[PDB]
Design a protein around this ligand. Structure first.
Ligand SMILES: Nc1ncnc2c1ncn2[C@@H]1O[C@H](COP(=O)(O)OC(=O)[C@@H]2CCCN2)[C@@H](O)[C@H]1O
Ligand SMILES: Nc1ncnc2c1ncn2[C@@H]1O[C@H](COP(=O)(O)OC(=O)[C@@H]2CCCN2)[C@@H](O)[C@H]1O
Lengths: 505, 496
């Protein structure tokens, strides 16, 4: 029976227990770090990735699918990329009883395979921009201490890869990627991450620079939940991607990529969760609304039951047909309300509506959002609940309005406000080594501090911080401008940026 | 430039040529049988699997995702299953530079993985039924004569697996799978296959029996394009799946499964295609309607061009926003009208809308369906094209009429490729000259029938595919081969 307040000290146990109790994943598959996505959990993952796919389509990035297997000669082409990943590669060496003539790696990430094909698809400036993405699984062997969604050896994800005529287009693409992240993470999943330029000594292998969303988790560690990279022209030279420009000069195009995985789901579940279990944003709720008939099955009350059950159906049909909501009806009269409520709250269903004989007589039903619970139940007339208004805007877009929709939207907005407040509370300004360390140890989250360099010699301080408190310098936000005359918290030299330090997953 | 006629003799080449010219897939990925799905092709495959997912969801089959890797120990548990699939296993043997403790197989199909987990998930009758499906790729190493979508080594597919309390529930599940297949194949993709109980000597390895859709391709060979299987209790025993029933008895549940792959897309493209290239059912058309401004860029005619382009945008906006259709505008004036026509013809765009000054002055536009072409173009008032009011619109009507024309023709093709035979000679003669499916009354559905299968393969390289149990045997009907009373009508064909 799941009942555990979700705090810094308890989160790790809370997460493992909720994974099982809500039947999201099954870790008992006998391959370490390869977890079964069970139905209730997979619906959430699929919803997140479908949204990504949909949003990528709107900004001209086309969905494709590559094979899982990458030939060894592809994977070894780019030096810095392969050294970064070679320990992570599963190798296929036989087909049946016979050895393959060329070994095949299961993709740890798809740059080497995709850019080998870009080399063929890109011959002229006419072929650019070339923007694709795929939703698939990748494979990482060396992943240690596996945790569902957060650190696994088979990882469900989406990767976008774009080929650009110029440096400026490449830079502009990064903003397009960030637009999609904000839509997914904040507008839809109601949480926030710290946007950073990753420290240059820990860039994506092969990248010219790497930008990330480091999300504060309830334990106080950060989780890298988006990776958005400018690969420059390095891969284009290695994989011989060349296009003839308008002057018929042969040019190496720029490459960019963006990746999100099951960690996005990890964040949404973890940040919004409470002592009763899950609290799901509407996007990823397999059931937006559970309607529960109450007080049925009484003696010589078969007629009243039919009327109650009849109205429950008319509510369900309106919510499904007119609003597109996912609705369930729990008409199992053997189960007590206590046991039903436990279960639906455990599973994080945003709204329950209770309809019974008495309330039906008064023309009312009870609507209870998941985050605030029974104490702040809403009495809403049944007529109002059935009330749907619609209009068409200038752009011929249908705008539907309804109280249950309003309640879902208000629910989202409360989750968002609470999640953003949590993030904001876990960014702490520090003016010294000691203040950063005490923050990491006592509070967790991100320690923000002015720092003297964004260049490679900053790694010296990354190591001291790691040794002192196991926190690492994650990066800085270039859009945050340092005040003149501010000094570096660590060296005393003039500050050129604010670095962010944290314990990482 | 693509202009290959699509006949029984040219189909194989026609298929290879249009895969490339339409940029559906890319065979130049240098692992044999592992092809890239390019954007235009992937839209199609994705539309088909999303529909399958949606339909399965509507009948209580929930989507899940299992790992790609299956440990060797799991894979070898069911004797006939492993004998059926061992040759086709890619074996993962190293993690980094280090050999793996236990070999991992890339899933050739997921029964052994999934039923190991059913064992853990099933405890009592209240856990049943348990119904799942997944869209993913599987791996079959031994596949030869690879051909995109039809015969590949990495195969994009959907597989559904259900666990049932009774034998009757398992039989009823097969009917649900079949309704979904009919929806996808016929209602949406506008083609037909022959439903058969697969001959018992050629069942799915580990199945009690197999049901299939064998679809007639333009070359006259048949392609197994759906596989729907009753696994009985065999796997449940092997993987220790047990449930406590209402009377607290420990009993084995019944398992069923169903699979569709990239072959569905293959059939749709192949059956509807013509000498101009693809002809796409609306479900898999990345673009339903291409709108083309015509007669623009003339000397001193910039005013009239912006009127034409303005109206072209108004039509696109109405079709996109009000009706939900996928619409593309080709206003690139640097390209010839001939090159545009050829391209959208080749890519199979259901409808072409042409808008020019001349037609704009009469308040009209030209609508050309892809299947019938410019000889049967429609001249439709623009106000009617813009009129939207169940949603009704003349362009939506043209897409529906187009869809119905595709179905009628593909169904007629199927029907013309089923030939009734009353003797061994007629079967051989049908197979050798006409192709398609040879249907004949036959004395048994059981294992002794394989003697005649062997004789037929030796004569003309055709095999007995199976029989449809729904077909009534005419009173007094005799077996075409033995003269004994017929108990079924077998279907024989050359296979892919
Ligand atoms: N073990 C794991 N378990 C779960 N999620 C993970 C794991 N490892 C990484 N992720 C998730 O994959 C995301 C993208 O990977 P990235 O940042 O290294 O960039 C790229 O790879 C580029 C972009 C696509 C093509 N390559 C990571 O940010 C993390 O959220
Ligand atoms: N090499 C290939 N290339 C393209 N498509 C293929 C290929 N091989 C097979 N198919 C396609 O996969 C389908 C399912 O395979 P099935 O019939 O043996 O049944 C099952 O597997 C059960 C049901 C799912 C879980 N197990 C085949 O009908 C064919 O359409």
């Amino acid at each position: 029976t799941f009942s555990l307040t979700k705090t810094r000290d308890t989160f790790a146990d809370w997460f493992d227990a909720i994974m099982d109790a809500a039947e999201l994943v099954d870790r008992r598959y006998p391959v370490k770090g390869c977890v079964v996505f069970r139905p209730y959990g997979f619906f959430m993952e699929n919803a997140i990735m479908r949204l990504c796919e949909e949003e990528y389509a709107k900004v001209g990035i086309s969905q494709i699918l590559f094979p899982t297997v990458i030939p060894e000669s592809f994977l070894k082409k780019e030096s810095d990329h392969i050294k970064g990943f070679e320990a992570e590669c599963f190798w296929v060496e036989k087909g049946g009883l016979q050895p393959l003539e060329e070994r095949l790696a299961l993709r740890p990430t798809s740059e080497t395979a995709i850019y080998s094909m870009f080399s063929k698809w890109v011959r002229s400036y006419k072929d650019l921009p070339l923007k694709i993405h795929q939703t698939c699984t990748i494979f990482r062997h060396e992943t240690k201490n596996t945790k569902p969604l957060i650190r696994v050896r088979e990882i469900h994800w989406n990767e976008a890869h774009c080929c650009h005529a110029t440096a400026e287009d490449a830079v502009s693409q990064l903003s397009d990627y960030w637009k999609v992240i904000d839509t997914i993470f904040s507008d839809e999943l109601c949480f926030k991450g710290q946007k950073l330029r990753r420290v240059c000594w820990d860039r994506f292998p092969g990248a010219d620079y790497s930008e990330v969303s480091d999300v504060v988790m309830p334990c106080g560690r950060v989780l890298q939940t988006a990776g958005i990279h400018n690969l420059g022209q390095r891969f284009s030279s290695t994989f011989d991607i060349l296009y003839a420009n308008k002057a018929n000069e042969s040019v190496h195009p720029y490459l960019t990529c963006a990746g999100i995985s099951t960690r996005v789901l990890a964040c949404a579940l973890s940040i919004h969760g409470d002592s009763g279990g899950l609290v799901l944003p509407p996007l990823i709720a397999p059931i937006h609304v559970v309607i529960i008939p109450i007080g049925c099955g009484k003696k010589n009350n078969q007629e009243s039951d039919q009327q109650v059950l009849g109205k429950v159906n008319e509510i369900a049909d309106t919510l499904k047909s007119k609003l597109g909501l996912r609705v369930s009806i729990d008409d199992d009269f053997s189960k007590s309300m206590g046991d039903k409520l436990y279960y639906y709250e455990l599973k994080g269903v945003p709204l329950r509506i209770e309809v019974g004989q008495r309330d039906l007589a008064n023309g009312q039903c009870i609507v209870v959002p998941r985050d605030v619970g029974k104490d702040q139940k809403r009495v809403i007339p049944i007529t109002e609940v059935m009330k749907v208004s619609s209009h068409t805007t200038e752009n011929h877009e249908l705008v539907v309005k309804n109280v249950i929709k309003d309640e879902l939207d208000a629910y989202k907005a409360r989750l968002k406000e609470k999640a953003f407040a949590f993030h904001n509370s876990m960014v702490t300004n520090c003016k010294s080594f000691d203040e950063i360390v005490a923050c990491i140890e006592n509070k967790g989250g991100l320690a923000r501090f002015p720092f003297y360099t964004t260049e490679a010699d900053g790694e010296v301080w990354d190591k001291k911080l790691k040794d002192a408190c196991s926190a690492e310098i994650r990066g800085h936000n270039p859009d945050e401008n340092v005040l003149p005359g501010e000094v570096c918290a660590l060296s005393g030299k003039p500050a050129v940026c604010y670095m962010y330090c944290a314990k990482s997953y």
